[PDB]
Design a protein around this ligand. Sequence first.
Ligand code: FAD
Ligand code: FAD
Lengths: 448, 448
Amino acid sequence: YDADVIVVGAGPSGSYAAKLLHDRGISVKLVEAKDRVGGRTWSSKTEAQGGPIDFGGQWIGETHVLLPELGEELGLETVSSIKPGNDIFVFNGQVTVGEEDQAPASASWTAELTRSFELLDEAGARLGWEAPWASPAVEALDGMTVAQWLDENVSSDEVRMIHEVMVNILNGANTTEVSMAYWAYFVHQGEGIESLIGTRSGAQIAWFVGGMGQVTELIADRLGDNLHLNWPVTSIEQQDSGVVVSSGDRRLTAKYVILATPPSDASRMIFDQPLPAKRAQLQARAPMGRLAKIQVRYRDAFWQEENLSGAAFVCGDLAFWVFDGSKPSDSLATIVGFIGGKHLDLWHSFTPEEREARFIDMLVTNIGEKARDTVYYHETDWTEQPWTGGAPVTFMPTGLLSSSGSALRGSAGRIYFAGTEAAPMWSGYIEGALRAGKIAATDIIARL
Amino acid sequence: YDADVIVVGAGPSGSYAAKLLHDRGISVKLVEAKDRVGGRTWSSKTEAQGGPIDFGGQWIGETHVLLPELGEELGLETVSSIKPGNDIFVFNGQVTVGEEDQAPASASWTAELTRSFELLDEAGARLGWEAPWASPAVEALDGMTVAQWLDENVSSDEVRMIHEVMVNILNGANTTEVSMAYWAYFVHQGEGIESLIGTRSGAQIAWFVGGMGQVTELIADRLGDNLHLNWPVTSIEQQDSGVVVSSGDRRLTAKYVILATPPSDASRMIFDQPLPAKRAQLQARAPMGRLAKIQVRYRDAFWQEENLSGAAFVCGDLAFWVFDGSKPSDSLATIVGFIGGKHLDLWHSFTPEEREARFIDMLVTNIGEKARDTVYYHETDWTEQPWTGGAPVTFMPTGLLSSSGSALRGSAGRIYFAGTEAAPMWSGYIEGALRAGKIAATDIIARL
Ligand SMILES: Cc1cc2nc3c(=O)[nH]c(=O)nc-3n(C[C@H](O)[C@H](O)[C@H](O)COP(=O)(O)OP(=O)(O)OC[C@H]3O[C@@H](n4cnc5c(N)ncnc54)[C@H](O)[C@@H]3O)c2cc1C
Ligand SMILES: Cc1cc2nc3c(=O)[nH]c(=O)nc-3n(C[C@H](O)[C@H](O)[C@H](O)COP(=O)(O)OP(=O)(O)OC[C@H]3O[C@@H](n4cnc5c(N)ncnc54)[C@H](O)[C@@H]3O)c2cc1C
């Protein structure tokens, strides 16, 4: 054998699984398709004026345990993402100012928003994170779309617009595309909707100074020539005695394989023998969402003069989730905008010059005319990255979670499923990637 | 350049495009991932006792033009598939005998079945075959499943069960999985439901003696070393003056490429530069169905003694579409059964021996105790074939046809989309594969 274990994919999940194996002195190879590690995490200390920038995922949550622990182990510093001032809600170009991070008690829609979150959380609780595919509630929820559930359960146009931007960003998909069962499950296993839409709480509370890309890069440094970049896995062969992992004519042999890729990217690989039917259907039918991350930098955080946090739920035909991404040690202030799903479909119909003009028009509504005085502007389109299907997460259409969801976790013979989609909680997030890597590495260390 | 054109995929569509280019004197290479040509067509003259057998698609339709013309050009003989006698309808093990190929006027559900076919045909005509993604009716139908359409349009259990077997076989997918827009479009562009479910009419009227695999095999012979087998395309690079098609380290260069694969199988390839957004989303999100084709042979066609055609709609938890697949030149009689979608998910939970036992028990209901005296039994599971996503066809979940469906046809720069899914009519069928290949080859001939 070339190694005891081959890990396929050097995102946070595969990188962490390889780190845990290498730390125990188990022989491991980490193979990665791209010319870099990080997967959906990606940062540069030098490419953007004003300081490090994260092109992919960057927020650390308040309940995350493995991510801050690994940050400490790799010698990274965290900084708070929390901003003072009022968040805003924008509906078709019209601004409602929040009260800190709360919808204003005076708005007609605030009471129904709270009710709509309890309904969504209740649907999630009926499925659970442990075995949603086996829930007596899953058949009915998995035969309908989020759009259909919203038609049945939400009256207020404002409440419906907030739910639409949340799904189009948090799943990168239209409410007409995503199973309500998958959405309800996804939100519950992220500790509920208020957790995932936190602007200063829940999933969004901190950053690593120097960028999130450092997590995988500092692991790659520990692994040395056990990491192979530019090594796209084309086929995986299971034998009685081990596994053969191929990239074209290049072959590596091992006792076990950890597949640390999204199900949709695993579908590109040829398996002999064929994977279990539920897993093969999961890989073919659970696509990635679509998201773009747009970042603008300014000489200073001028919105703080108006007691604006910079955080905004921008709803309508071109919907965004907007944050202040500034670190105290940066040289410039940063606004980060996300656009996904059906809103990104419209964005894709525009020229690059039209997109930048529309983005800056949107910011002028949120933070005023100083938003035109940009020092830097950048878009990362996560539908155009090779061997990454999309962003931020995998989603499922009707019928899949209830028929095939159990194949998100565990193993098939000598192939162990990692990647964030395999995590029992925090699937979709870096914390889930680490949890899924830890489970696969832990189970293989017991088999060795 | 290695050739003017590289054609990717040696199913009927690619094979036919390569043939048309070669016949016009245009230099062409045909590259195929598998160790054989044919794709979803696949036959053997010698592997099965009693005569040639088709593991993949085999029926020729009464309106098909290119397919009978090509068979004639390649020197193949056609024979009628039409069988005399009564078809049957089976509901959870209870037989209703038809009147030839008709539901009996005396059955409580026959009038409702005819009404339901008119409602389905009327939904498809609102979308049309030319540009269903542009129909005013498409967004509403594309946001709901076939199962939800059935809940609104169909009352009787028997009628609902017939529609469920039709979708699970003709799209290889559950009614809760398939967009009603997609299904309605698919059926319309196949000349309507009665055309696609014909047992002795419409899409099912003839066969090629010797097997449908002979079409691609005889084209392969004509192409000689212009065909490369075991040549899975891993990347396609578009340049100013041509394209580079790669299989690992192996490279071919041409002026133009014909992609003659299903969208889902095209998603495996890495494109530099990235395809148009609609096309990239289509390839990622239009999966293939799941189908198995089960064939049993007997000393004679004993069901004819009971004035049974051998054709049956077997409905319920384990649903099949059954035919007499006997040719006069065969030395045994053949029964052919299809199982797909959610019925095939249940079948997959059984062992190979449980499946054979259950299939023979099912045939005993349809044609009596002599069905136990098998001479030959074979299953082709079209979810276990490398570089074919499934069978019989590509399907779409909610949201896709209305957002991205236009990307089924045409071209992106020097890359021309073929494969049956690109056909303006008879998409899903061999006739469609030939039509799409003809359109791609004709447009490239004009460009050169
Ligand atoms: C714009 C954006 C914003 C996000 N925001 C956050 C956030 O703030 N906080 C958070 O926690 N999460 C966030 N996420 C999600 C987070 O990035 C992912 O959950 C996490 O990266 C998943 O890690 P992973 O290792 O499971 O998969 P990935 O990061 O997707 O890594 C998979 C790896 O597998 C490789 N691979 C694929 N196919 C092959 C093959 N055939 N051979 C070999 N290698 C292959 C890929 O190239 C890739 O490197 C965000 C994502 C994006 C893109
Ligand atoms: C069980 C079954 C029953 C059917 N019944 C009928 C019927 O009776 N009549 C009928 O008209 N239709 C029928 N069909 C459908 C019919 O078989 C298909 O419509 C037809 O074969 C489509 O032809 P195609 O060339 O578009 O695609 P395919 O036949 O799918 O061929 C695509 C080819 O591309 C190759 N390929 C994929 N990826 C790559 C890559 N990366 N590099 C290189 N090559 C690649 C594949 O290996 C394959 O050979 C049936 C299908 C099945 C499976």
